[PDB]
């Protein structure tokens, strides 16, 4: 899906509160999505193995 305009994620200056919050938000998002990606890949690969073995046993 498309995403066009977002917050800034790199900073060349020292601003404090808002910078801290933006970094926290992006980091939280990244960690949650990485967790989701690892879990989805693990689950889908387990399902692939299971379906192949099930087809062998079916035959």
């Amino acid at each position: 899906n498309e995403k066009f305009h977002q917050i800034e994620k790199e900073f060349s200056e020292v601003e404090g509160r808002i910078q801290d919050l933006e970094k926290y938000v992006e980091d939280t998002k990244i960690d949650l999505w990485s967790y989701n990606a690892e879990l989805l890949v693990a689950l889908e690969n387990q399902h692939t193995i299971d379906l192949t073995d099930s087809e062998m046993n079916k035959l």
Binding site: E2, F4, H5, Q6, E10
Partner: protein, 106 residues
């Protein structure tokens, strides 16, 4: 005064000149202080110049502070000043779209 009678928001970019010394202020504006109040029906911004020396950049020890003001349709932009005003020449069409900016050397 400047009215807004079109059907889109208008964006005004203006500024305030902080000269470096007092003789510069008297030379450019003939009075030791300015005051700029730019306002509309739903907004007002007053800015006061700060005469003082800044570290020279391109041999300039003065500065310009840039401000902006958005004016919705049917509204009126009012500019009130006694000096040090860096006035606008017109307006920017401000659209609502899917554009963005990105810093890259690619």
């Amino acid at each position: 005064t400047m009215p807004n009678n079109e059907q889109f928001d208008k964006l005004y970019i203006w500024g305030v000149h902080h000269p470096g010394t007092d003789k510069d202020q008297i030379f450019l504006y003939a009075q030791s202080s300015g005051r700029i109040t730019v306002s509309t029906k739903r907004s007002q911004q007053a800015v006061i110049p700060n005469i003082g020396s800044r570290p020279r950049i391109r041999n300039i020890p003065s500065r310009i502070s840039i401000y902006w003001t958005i004016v919705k349709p049917g509204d009126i932009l009012l500019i009130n000043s006694t000096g040090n005003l860096i006035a606008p020449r017109g307006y920017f069409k401000i659209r609502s779209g899917k554009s963005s900016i990105m810093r890259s050397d690619a």
